[PDB]
Design a protein around this ligand. Structure first.
Ligand SMILES: Nc1nc2c(ncn2[C@@H]2O[C@H](COP(=O)(O)OP(=O)(O)OP(=O)(O)O)[C@@H](O)[C@H]2O)c(=O)[nH]1
Ligand SMILES: [Mg+2]
Lengths: 168, 491
């Protein structure tokens, strides 16, 4: 069957592991355990297609982020994740996109901007900024919440659709 | 298979690529022909079946990244000294009983992952790897760290979680650049006082140890965002500790010997959004202890010695989730009506005979658990909990439900098991979103209301050990769907 190699990048603590496990195991991880790397293979049906998702959960902290270039080099689509209560993580979004564009050596790379932790009552990132930023990249933007599962399927499935457009 | 292994080695040197990726190829023995690939700067061999590395790998002098995670290596070739430019060494998920002697000689290493191994010794030669910024020996069998740990003055993260450390060498206070120190799931009996030197320390894992106290010098780690001391032998906190951690988001003193609240007054909870104190011996919550905790939204007092609540407990207006399970509470005060921002209220395993009429003022309440109490009656005011979705009343003395129970238009879970209950109200039919109705172990329930069929989404239901003698024995012998269709007929 068809496979989609997905990579989740973003600053440390934004929710990359909680989003993946929410999609893969249908539950919210409350504890924080920093990631070096974690890989998953999960079968799912998107828009009628039975396909296999190959999710690579990368590191956000820099000291953990050794070998981040190689993980990005093999991925086909990227979830660029930031937390809406962490303005530093949203500023880093442009750094992750440029690092992806250079390791893949391509201008168009299937990519989706993700704003996590929308369940939180107070935020520090303007949704108007994220829509504007993703618009200038040519990629979609999706507000998610790994605690309430809001938008979690939307994020990964939209990325898969962006990979289809690339292959087709 | 092996066909791609030897042929892609020639493919690498023909392309003259500075990167070889032989991962997930089930490789058992790396062929010696890799000595020709001296232009390599990255060699990825993770997720294979290697048990040893060939000596010829020591020819790759230009190597900077060596990924050997998820293998079965027990040592490394002593010829790896020639890799004088190696930066990161990933050896996690292997079978090492000690750090290979050659790794203590790779003084250019900045990143070293030894996670998930059987390592028992950290030699004093670890001081040679002083350019390290990340040292992860998580999930090993290490019982002691040498004092030479203090010469890794570039460390940002020291991950020694899931080991058997009984003491931390006091020289740890010399790794000033540390922001992440993970010591959880060990056997620490105390902590060195020099821990206050790590002024950049923002994340400190101490849970699941044997600590009996916290050094007062921890007040110098004012960058800490979370203090989680779960599962220890601590009873008090040093003077002006919690007030000093001006960036603390959550405090977790669960599973300890706290018989009283920590001293400091209300000024020590002015920054936490959460507070977990479950599984202790606290006999009273101090009056006014939360008069300055204006962001505290979650409180957990489960499994303690609380027999009553403070008089100003009704002023906890910023509380969203409150857990008072497993205590000796005999009464809920009427002042509970002031907690208008409460969304989850857990009161299971207490001595509650009845509930106050002010309970109906919890407009935001979404989940109410009262399992294993002594409830003789429900207050009529439960009808005004418009936002309630889960009500757990299992194991009580309830004989009747208030007829207003049908006003719970958002109720989806109703647990009425292990009660007396002579009957359900006819107003049960207005519970539109009801989905789970547990009625098991009700020896007095000889009938079911005919209006129950109006609950369209009612899928899960248990009726084991219920007489239901007014209903036919053949209908009740079937199951939930049998009585589901039976009630639709007569109506
Ligand atoms: N309220 C809320 N908290 C979240 C959400 N997602 C993650 N968290 C919390 O944020 C913390 C970070 O979670 P992770 O998913 O491990 O963050 P990360 O991206 O994997 O961090 P790194 O491993 O360092 O890259 C965790 O403690 C979670 O409990 C969310 O959607 N809502
Ligand atoms: Mg992670």
């Amino acid at each position: 069957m068809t496979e989609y190699k997905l990579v989740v990048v973003g600053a440390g603590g934004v929710g990359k592991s909680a989003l993946t496990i929410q999609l893969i195991q249908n539950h919210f991880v409350d504890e924080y355990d920093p990631t070096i790397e974690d890989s998953y293979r999960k079968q799912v049906v998107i828009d009628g297609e039975t396909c296999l998702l190959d999710i690579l959960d990368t590191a956000g902290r820099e000291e953990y982020s050794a070998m981040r270039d190689q993980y990005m080099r093999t991925g086909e689509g990227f979830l660029c994740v930031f937390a809406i209560n962490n303005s530093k993580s949203f500023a880093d979004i442009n750094l992750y996109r440029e690092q992806i564009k250079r390791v893949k050596d391509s201008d168009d790379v299937p990519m989706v901007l993700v704003g996590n932790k929308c369940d939180l009552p107070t935020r520090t990132v303007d949704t108007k900024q994220a829509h504007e930023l993703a618009k200038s990249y040519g990629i979609p933007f999706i507000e998610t919440s790994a605690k309430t599962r809001q938008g979690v399927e939307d994020a990964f499935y939209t990325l898969v659709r962006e990979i289809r457009q690339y292959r087709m | 298979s092996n066909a791609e292994v030897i042929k892609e080695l020639n493919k690498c040197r023909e392309e003259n690529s500075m990167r070889l990726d032989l991962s997930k190829r089930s490789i058992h023995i790396l062929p010696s022909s890799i000595k020709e690939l001296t232009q390599l700067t990255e060699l990825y061999l993770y997720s294979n079946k290697l048990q040893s590395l060939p000596a010829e790998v020591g020819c790759l002098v230009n190597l900077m990244t060596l990924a050997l995670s998820e293998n079965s290596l027990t040592s490394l070739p002593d010829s790896l000294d020639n890799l004088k430019k190696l930066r990161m060494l990933d050896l996690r998920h292997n079978k090492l009983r000690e750090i290979p002697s050659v790794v203590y000689r790779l003084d250019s290493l900045t990143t070293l992952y030894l996670r998930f191994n059987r390592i028992t010794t950290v030699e004093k030669d670890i001081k040679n790897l002083s350019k390290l910024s990340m040292l992860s020996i998580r999930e090993n069998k290490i019982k002691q760290l040498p004092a030479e740990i203090g010469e890794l003055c570039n460390l940002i993260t020291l991950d020694v979680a899931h080991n058997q450390l009984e003491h931390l060498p006091k020289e740890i206070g010399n790794c000033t650049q540390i922001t992440n120190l993970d010591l959880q799931h060990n056997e620490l009996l105390d902590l060195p006082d020099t821990i206050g030197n790590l002024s950049s320390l923002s994340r400190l894992g101490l849970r699941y140890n044997r600590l009996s106290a916290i050094p007062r010098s921890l007040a110098k780690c004012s960058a800490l965002e979370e203090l989680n001391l779960e599962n220890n032998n601590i009873s008090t906190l040093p003077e002006s500790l919690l007030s000093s951690l001006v960036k603390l988001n959550s405090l977790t003193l669960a599973r300890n010997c706290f018989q009283l609240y920590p001293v400091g007054g209300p000024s020590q909870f002015s920054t936490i959004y959460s507070l977990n104190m479950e599984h202790n011996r606290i006999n009273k919550i101090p009056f006014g202890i939360f008069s300055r905790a204006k962001v505290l939204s979650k409180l957990n007092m489960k499994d303690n010695q609380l027999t009553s609540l403070p008089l100003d407990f009704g002023t906890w207006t910023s509380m969203v989730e409150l857990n008072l399970a497993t205590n000796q509470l005999t009464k809920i005060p009427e002042d509970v009506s002031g907690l208008v921002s409460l969304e989850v209220l857990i009161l299971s395993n207490n001595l509650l005979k009845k509930l106050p009429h002010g309970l109906g003022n919890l407009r935001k309440l979404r989940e109410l658990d009262l399992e294993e109490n002594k409830l003789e009656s429900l207050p009529n005011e439960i009808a005004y909990l418009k936002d309630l979705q889960k009500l757990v009343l299992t194991n009580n003395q309830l004989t009747t439900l208030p007829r207003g129970i049908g006003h719970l238009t958002n109720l989806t879970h109703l647990g009425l098991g292990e009660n007396l209950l002579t009957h359900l109200p006819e107003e049960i039919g207005t519970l539109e979103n009801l989905e789970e109705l547990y009625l098991n172990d009700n020896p007095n329930l000889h009938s079911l209301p005919f209006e129950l069929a109006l609950c369209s989404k009612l899928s899960i239901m248990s009726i084991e050990n219920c007489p239901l003698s007014h209903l036919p024995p053949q209908i009740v012998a079937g199951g939930p769907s049998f009585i589901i269709q039976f009630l639709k007929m007569q109506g």
